[PDB]
Design a protein around this ligand. Structure first.
Ligand SMILES: OC[C@H]1O[C@@H](O[C@H]2[C@H](O)[C@@H](O)[C@H](O[C@@H]3[C@@H](O)[C@@H](O)O[C@H](CO)[C@H]3O)O[C@@H]2CO)[C@H](O)[C@@H](O)[C@@H]1O
Ligand SMILES: OC[C@H]1O[C@@H](O[C@H]2[C@H](O)[C@@H](O)[C@H](O)O[C@@H]2CO)[C@H](O)[C@@H](O)[C@@H]1O
Ligand SMILES: [Ca+2]
Length: 260
């Protein structure tokens, strides 16, 4: 654990809600809130991932009974022009080009996708990607890899601190039955520090060293939100269990708060 935290977190009293998706409207995700990422479907995704992210496909991404559903399936979507030979479909949504935030408290209430292979994620990347990944700054509010389905991972990545060179700043905790019950996954991002937590408890803290070095604090510019369920890579360490499909992440809401 390279970014340990141990402190409470809660929506600050002096913040207001500035953005939410409550997933109130069944059917397609609200196109004024979310866009689909298809950028690497034909080529194969990063992290040796095994999914095809289907855009506009209710089988993988839909709003039902007040929840977003991102569902993994074992199927070859060979009719898709951007199909890349994948054995699985899934979803990836982001607020890129629609909404982003510099600082804030982000709360996502979600039930995660289980089964060996599954890699549900709730994360952020900087809107200004001119420095490339990883320099632009990424915030993993929640990852879980379903070979270890009770373990919630909270991580940030920067030019200096990232998984490629094993310097990522992260921590972890566990939660009761994360695929069977909702928990709140939360980020408290200020100019001084990030806390990442579950159910009101920060288990991860990453401070701004205030050295003005973009390499170690790229987080004084806006980030957009990403929701996806990857398959394989880190999620596939103990293989991809065909019996687990279909598997779904349900997201009751995303709420963003900022200094009133
Ligand atoms: O390998 C260089 C290419 O990286 C691309 O960026 C990827 C990166 O490869 C990938 O490891 C990273 O994966 C994410 C994790 O770092 C973490 O943030 O959690 C995410 C959700 O689980 C996980 O996807 O994603 C990067 C962004 O897709 C660059 O896009 C590319 O230009 C570069 O050549
Ligand atoms: O593989 C990408 C994945 O890397 C994760 O980093 C560490 C992780 O913190 C640690 O718990 C595990 O044992 O090693 C991995 C790979 O070095 C990182 O936490 C994620 O954000 C990232 O998606
Ligand atoms: Ca809801």
């Amino acid at each position: 654990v390279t970014a340990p935290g141990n402190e409470p977190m809660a929506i600050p009293s002096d913040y207001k809600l500035v953005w939410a998706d409550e997933f109130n409207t069944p059917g397609a995700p609200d196109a004024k809130k979310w866009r689909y990422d298809t950028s690497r479907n034909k080529e194969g995704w990063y992290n040796n991932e095994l999914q095809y992210y289907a855009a506009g496909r209710p089988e993988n991404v839909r709003v039902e009974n007040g929840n977003l559903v991102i569902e993994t399936r074992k199927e070859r979507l060979t009719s898709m022009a951007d199909y890349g030979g994948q054995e699985y479909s899934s979803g990836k949504l982001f607020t890129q080009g629609l909404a982003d935030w510099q600082y804030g408290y982000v709360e996502v209430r979600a039930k995660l996708a289980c089964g060996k292979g599954m890699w549900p994620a709730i994360w952020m990347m900087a809107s200004d990607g001119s420095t490339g990944w990883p320099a632009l700054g990424s915030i993993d509010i929640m990852e879980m890899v379903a070979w270890d389905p009770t373990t919630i991972h909270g991580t940030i990545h920067t030019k200096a601190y990232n998984h490629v060179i094993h310097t990522q700043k992260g921590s972890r905790t566990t939660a009761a039955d994360p695929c069977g019950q909702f928990h709140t996954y939360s980020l408290d991002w200020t100019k001084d520090r990030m806390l990442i937590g579950v159910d009101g408890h920060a288990y991860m803290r990453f401070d701004n060293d205030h050295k003005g070095n973009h390499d170690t604090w790229p987080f004084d510019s806006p980030q957009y939100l990403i929701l996806n369920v990857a398959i394989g890579g880190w999620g596939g360490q103990q293989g991809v269990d065909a019996a687990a499909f279909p598997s779904k992440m349900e997201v009751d809401y995303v709420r963003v708060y900022q200094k009133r």
